[model samples]
Target: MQIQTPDWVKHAVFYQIFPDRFARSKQPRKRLLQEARWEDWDSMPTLQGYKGGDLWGIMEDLDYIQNLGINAIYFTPIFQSASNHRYHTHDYYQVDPMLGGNEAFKELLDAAHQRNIKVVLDGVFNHSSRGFFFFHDVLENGPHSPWVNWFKIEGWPLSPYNGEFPANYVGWAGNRALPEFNHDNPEVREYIMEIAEYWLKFGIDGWRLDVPFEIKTPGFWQEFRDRTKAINPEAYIVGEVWGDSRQWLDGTQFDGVMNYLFAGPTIAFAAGDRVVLEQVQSRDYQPYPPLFAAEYATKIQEVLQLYPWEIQLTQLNLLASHDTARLMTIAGGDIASVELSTLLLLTFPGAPSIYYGDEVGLPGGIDPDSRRGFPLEANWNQEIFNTHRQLITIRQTYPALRTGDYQVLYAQGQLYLFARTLGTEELIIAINAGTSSATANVDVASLHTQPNKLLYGTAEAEWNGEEGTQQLSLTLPARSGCILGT
Candidate 1:
């Protein structure tokens, strides 16, 4: 599963899967013994009820995912967790039997490798199910128990450090089911290290560490990284800090992060917010000023500076995930905004991520609801898939998108135009922020190239450099986007 140094990983495109909603096994959904703890979502509709998406479904769709031009996969969580989302890992030694056990995993790994694709499993080591091995031991034995030393537990007074009772540690609200693990304990640390190594032994390519900041400690991360690298030098470890994780990637624990920083601001800009110009000029890795019209570019610069521009490009970029609301809903259910958002995601720095059905232009409000089952043939998001296919083909062929250099040419108004140039190849990404046709003068003089059409939409077209020009002008359709190249 481990690829080579800077292998395809640095340039690889990634797709995320919310297994519970992605694809159902060939077997009947009702036949799968669904977990009980995951079904109670009367309050959160987006993540309401998981019908039954399994690994079998994923294996069935390998060809579909590969055809989309993505070569990497990041499944949310496949460990045996009591919850529907499976963030609370009960066991690390095995995949969720429901997700298809060891045998199916081997087949999946082999299938992905045949296509040169890589897989990164989500590591939820920060905590575990109430019945985790460490927690279970705490129950059978008293304070004098060795397991008690492995967690942050209190004495008879049960203060902030106790694990004997649910209230002893920080809880995800009142949910006692998800107890925080003892990150400080060396034994606990060893257990996680073993778990990761165990999965790597199972043919896993890499890991996306969940809530890494909450895990054991800085020393533990250092140790874990060393051990992981020892087992598989090509193994990659990314953190799920959800915000600015540049500090975490200071070369100690992670190679990159989930890229929430770029996503939120980009979405806001697409929704009609005037981004300040000074922000764009401040990014550390920005070789040139991004389009000065939008304010989000500055924030993007700040986040990308944690690493270089190339590192930013390699990070997993996504506008929405199972944990957040769907993109269409983020745009107030406007399908046009969703289209623009998807286009921007593919063109932006880092590998763009598609959350299961986002390509079908899924219209979701929030969690649980956003995590609905994949649409059957009767009502699938084929247009989104078509658009995705086109973009994937472009990415696979163009070095500008796959591993080219990124420059923000403009980031103002309903217009976001950028260029990626690597050696002789170049890509111009144009986005129309408005809901109607809008025209902008192309500054070919700055780029030193003419323009021709690479991609087109009902509203916009990517002008490649076939036509020479100092003043490039084109009318982009309302609520649409396009990519150009030369």
Candidate 2:
């Protein structure tokens, strides 16, 4: 089957936001936050604490987000739940009351749409908490509950908060607080489907499906794709699959996935030995044994070939997220690591997602550390922010960077060179992930025109001969990258 994904996604630059930590609106909620004492916004994030970053705050910051060259926003779970993360969803239909509820969301959505910014919310459908209405009925009524089929209840008495007994039903990862939904039941399937459809109809640009691989029911995701597409054909559906996502990107399931495959190799190559494994404590996606240009080239090529071009363009490429440590912290606070990686990410052939505070050089380690509150301007890294804005502007200014064909021009010990071309527009990007300043003369013999103009970066660009020589030399500083255009 011919694969087709959202066209808008191919050009979108996303900013990932953790609602409860991003910002808090001054316009207090009538009663919820009026009585809700919150954690200090600048304090270290605790696992079970709420900072009260609401949707109104996000809505108020549309200018700040859009001005950063972000055309899309991917918010972590914002639905009503007992936890700050909201992954343990209680009510799928209601935005968390602490987040200013559905009213704030509607305003935020409208405001974001006004600025032409697309919004994708996290869909935690694989499992839900005991607070979910259906599951609550089972906890209250036991075997006699009408909604018992909605979940997998193994024994007579249900145990959501108790582990003294069998705990009976299965939780996602065996955590009793979160009960797994029984996808085998058609009613349960319809309910999840409705939630998806309802949100899409409610004007969310798309869904970033959370742990979609865990939903084992065959044809389930296929139907999800169909139902969601039937509502909005342009809607984007991305799954959080860490490994090879060929199974999901077949055009029948998801449009693309969170490209952790891109993230691991990128940080490994750019940061080299600086990658803190404790920060990236993932089981499947490992970034270690620092890769040279050739090694990095091979992994990147594998990713490009893994899916169709359509899927490739729509992939949500991110270096850091709420799941892992911030890129600043992961790279051990090296400015060059982030600079080089951001250069590559902006120029790559996918939608680049900037974790909320990544541009400001925010540092966090793992879990609660990764979910730290957004920083004030006084604590921001001006240079890093400038790099992000500059790179993002360059990307948006050039159509080639978004829809161009990618071709590697050169890959050596520490420097990697690649070209992006569309029609007459030509752009060559070079990065030195090594420890020393290096110069490489690349052969652009295959190109129609030579790229000799210095468009971005401090790299010195010079041509070996006049126009037709097709040989270009660049003196890239240590751990620096540049873009040359003609």
Q: What is the TM-score of each candidate against the true structure?
A: 0.83, 0.94
Look at candidate 2 and give me any clashing residue pairs.
none
Cα lDDT for residue 409, candidate 2:
84
Q: How accurate is candidate 1 locally (lDDT)?
A: 0.66
Which candidate has the top score in lDDT?
A: 2
**lDDT for each residue of candidate 1 in 1-486, tens digit (9 for 90 to 100):** 221234456667788887777786664332233433444534444334435667778888888788777888988888777756488777877677666556666777888889888998998887776667777666556565677766555453333335465445444434556667777776777878898889887778789887787764768877777788788877877777676676666565666677877676666666543322222222211212223236666766676666755456557778766666666556665566566667767766667777766777565545345446474543766777688777767766777676666676766666767776777777677777676677776665556554465564553443333445455655677667777765
Give all candidates' CA lDDT scores: 0.66, 0.86
Question: Candidate 1 — number of clashing residue pairs?
Answer: 36
Q: Report the lDDT tens digits of candidate 2 across residue range 271-299.
A: 99988777775754677778999989999
The per-prediction CA RMSD against the true structure, in angstroms, equals 7.1, 3.9
